[PDB]
């Protein structure tokens, strides 16, 4: 009965973690931020509408400059746009048209994409020949590739449907590190501001914090009732927010090792597809299956506002590095810039 | 007003726009089929007939009509994580082996392969993403089914069966039991073929069913339907 004995020891350890989490929870976040003023009402208008994609848009990522963004659609095309002038800087045809994620390198020299082909393709933008070439194809995942984020020009972290994350060295195309522990499909990831740690949310209603160098899971966070579609970090790096299929967003804290806040409203039952924060972290923006986006006071859990401009599911959204604008991309083949 | 480099960037953007519109038109004129079915149900035989990790894609052109066919059998993840990507396909080609009507599943004890294929067909046909999408159903291995139907009756799978143990009656019963799983009779049509291995009569059936689907789509576009 060695298996059963380790199951009892595991249950005892889970009870110990639960008791240690309840020990360090004297008050809630709502009890402390009950005296600060509300942010009011946030009215954001559609400044720009990026048109050109002919199928559903599955992902978008902003560049560090905050004037260039990359969008991916199922028509087989990564488009790199100029937000200020609505000009198409680049159009990259994909070998596989089943794309689910895209990333923009912090240097701006590369983009990445991936999807149902189980391959992360890295495309070089700054080429002497004047076109965009496939610089690398990273294969080794046995499930669909759901998210990818650049650490630098040579390292990339991908999440996949094979319940594993992976850190790749780009110039040799090899999995430098493999992150295992999730029992369901990892649907999203997010990198910290120092890129020492990253969090990943999976279809097992759990989010895991991973060290990038030592390749281990530091903390596990539960609380969601269903699949965690989206995850994003608070700007200090000491907290993250998860968007799930149970129509709630949740704010977890790495140092308190538990859930701090729940963002949910009885009128909204649709699941969250994408989450992001503002530059100060006071606003939390979440895209929903009800064709809209909701802006929540991240310290008071009130609905600060609604971004309602899409005719289909808001599949992805992002906030610029200076926080000047929010881009929402949706299944109605449009991206919209809100300010 | 714009500078010279801004004007040339706008001109490059409009060239990109025209290339996008041309690629969109050529993509729109193609036929996309999603291939589904149980493991070892004759899907490979169908792929070999049409042809002459990740998502397998098959390119073939019949009677001046181009067909892409997507096999997604290598995805071990749960279906609802990626099935919404195939919402706009022309048709779903569903392969069912008839010879599995008496063979128990090897993964799960006391569960039949035919019941599992009917539950998969019920999950796909009534999925919220495929309300208007049509299904081309291929019943594979009809000669092995005719050999087995002489010794093993259909009553081991369908206890409510009231017909004989002959080939054609049992085949018609299995066809009716697959076509009555369609809840949305009005919005979609189900086309059934017995995968005869003679004179390439399966590619012609796919062509005919896709032509019927394109006719119904044009009737919906013109407002008549």
């Amino acid at each position, epitope marked *: 009965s060695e298996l059963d004995q380790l199951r009892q020891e595991a249950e005892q350890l889970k009870n110990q973690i639960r008791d240690a989490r309840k020990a360090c929870a004297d008050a809630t976040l709502s009890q402390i931020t009950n005296n600060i003023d509300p942010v009011g009402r946030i009215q954001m208008r559609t400044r720009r509408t990026l048109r050109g994609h002919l199928a559903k848009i599955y992902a978008m990522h902003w560049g560090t400059d905050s004037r260039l963004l990359v969008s991916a659609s199922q028509d087989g095309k990564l488009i790199i746009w*100029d937000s200020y002038t609505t000009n198409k800087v680049h159009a990259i045809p994909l070998r596989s048209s089943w794309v689910m994620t895209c990333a923009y390198a912090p240097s701006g020299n590369y983009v990445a994409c991936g999807g149902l082909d189980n391959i992360c393709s890295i495309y070089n933008l700054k080429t002497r*020949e004047g076109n965009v070439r496939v610089s690398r194809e990273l294969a080794g995942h046995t499930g669909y590739l759901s998210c990818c984020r650049f650490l630098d020009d040579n390292q990339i972290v991908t999440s996949s449907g094979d319940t594993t994350c992976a850190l790749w060295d780009i110039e040799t195309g090899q999995q430098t590190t493999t992150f295992t522990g999730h029992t369901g499909d990892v649907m999203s990831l997010s990198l910290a501001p120092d890129t020492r740690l990253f969090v990943s949310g999976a279809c097992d209603a759990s989010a895991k914090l991973w060290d990038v160098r030592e390749g281990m899971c530091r903390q596990t966070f539960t609380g969601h009732e269903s699949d965690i579609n989206a995850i994003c970090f608070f700007p200090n790096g000491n907290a993250f927010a998860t968007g799930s299929d149970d129509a709630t967003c949740r704010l977890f804290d790495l140092r308190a090792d538990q859930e701090l806040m729940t963002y949910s409203h009885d009128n909204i039952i649709c699941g969250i597809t994408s989450v992001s924060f503002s530059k100060s972290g006071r606003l939390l923006l979440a895209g929903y299956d009800d064709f809209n986006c909701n802006v929540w006071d991240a310290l008071k859990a009130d609905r600060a506002g609604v971004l309602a401009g899409h005719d289909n599911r808001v599949s992805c959204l992002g906030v610029t590095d200076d926080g000047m604008a929010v881009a929402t991309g949706s299944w109605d083949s449009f991206l919209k810039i809100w300010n | 007003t714009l500078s010279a480099e801004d*004007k040339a960037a706008v001109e490059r953007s409009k*060239m990109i726009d025209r290339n996008l519109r041309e690629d969109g038109e050529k993509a729109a004129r193609e036929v996309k089929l999603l291939l589904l079915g149980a493991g070892e149900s004759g899907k490979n035989t169908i792929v070999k007939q049409m042809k002459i990790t990740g998502i397998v894609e098959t390119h073939f052109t019949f009677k001046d009509l181009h067909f892409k066919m997507f096999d997604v059998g290598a995805q071990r993840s749960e279906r609802k994580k990626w099935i919404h990507c195939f919402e706009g396909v022309t048709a779903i080609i569903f392969c069912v082996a008839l010879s599995d009507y008496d063979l128990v599943l090897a993964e799960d004890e006391e569960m039949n392969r035919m019941h599992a294929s009917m539950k998969l067909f019920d999950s796909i046909c009534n999925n919220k993403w495929f309300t208007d999408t049509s299904i081309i159903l291929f019943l594979n291995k009809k000669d092995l089914f005719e050999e087995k139907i002489k010794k093993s009756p259909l009553t081991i799978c369908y206890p409510e069966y009231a017909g004989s143990n002959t080939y054609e009656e049992a085949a018609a019963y299995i066809q009716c039991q697959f076509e009555d799983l369609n809840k949305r009779k009005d919005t979609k049509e189900i086309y059934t073929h017995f995968t005869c291995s003679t004179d390439t009569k399966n590619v012609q059936f796919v062509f005919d069913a896709v032509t019927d689907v394109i006719i119904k789509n044009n009737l919906k576009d013109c407002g008549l339907f």
Partner: single-chain antibody
Amino acid sequence: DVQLVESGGGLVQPGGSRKLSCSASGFAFSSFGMHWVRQAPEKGLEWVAYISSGSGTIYYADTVKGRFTISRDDPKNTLFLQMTSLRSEDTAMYYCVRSIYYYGSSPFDFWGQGTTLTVSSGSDIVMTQATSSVPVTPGESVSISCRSSKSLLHSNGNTYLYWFLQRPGQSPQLLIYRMSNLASGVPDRFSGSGSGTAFTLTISRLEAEDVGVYYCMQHLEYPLTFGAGTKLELK
């Protein structure tokens, strides 16, 4: 590698006709706009003509207007300049220059080797490079000044001035694009600092391959105009 080869030069009787060709290899030719730029032997560079990518936009200089015709054939990767009714002033070395235009791109980045054409016998921006020659020694910082008659700073925040270096016996090479941005393959010791109408190009720790003639070009408005060039020589 990227390569532009010109042909069609030689000696032409005055009033005649000739057709220059520029064959491109090693880059996506149909995504680059192309320029013809002439260089009379004693004088400096002078912009002649421009055809956009996709041939939707064509510009000429006033001197060559009505006489010259620029064209491109994209499947054969070839650029043509049909020159009719040639004059004595037309005698020059001709370069095809590639230039691509998007956000953050570097136009005028590659120049062809040039073909020699020998003919026997008002609102344009004026760029001024006041000092024609500067004597310098290696290892010493040096500043080259350009001055524009019109403000080159646009309302979008971009300042459109380019710095080129022509080594002796070679084609011009792009050094600085859009006032401050440095070009690919250019060493970091070059630096461009300008304030609307006055521009400076600084070469810290000068080396033996930095001698030659330095040209400033505006790209705010067509026609594109060059400076007279500032020459650096050793000793």
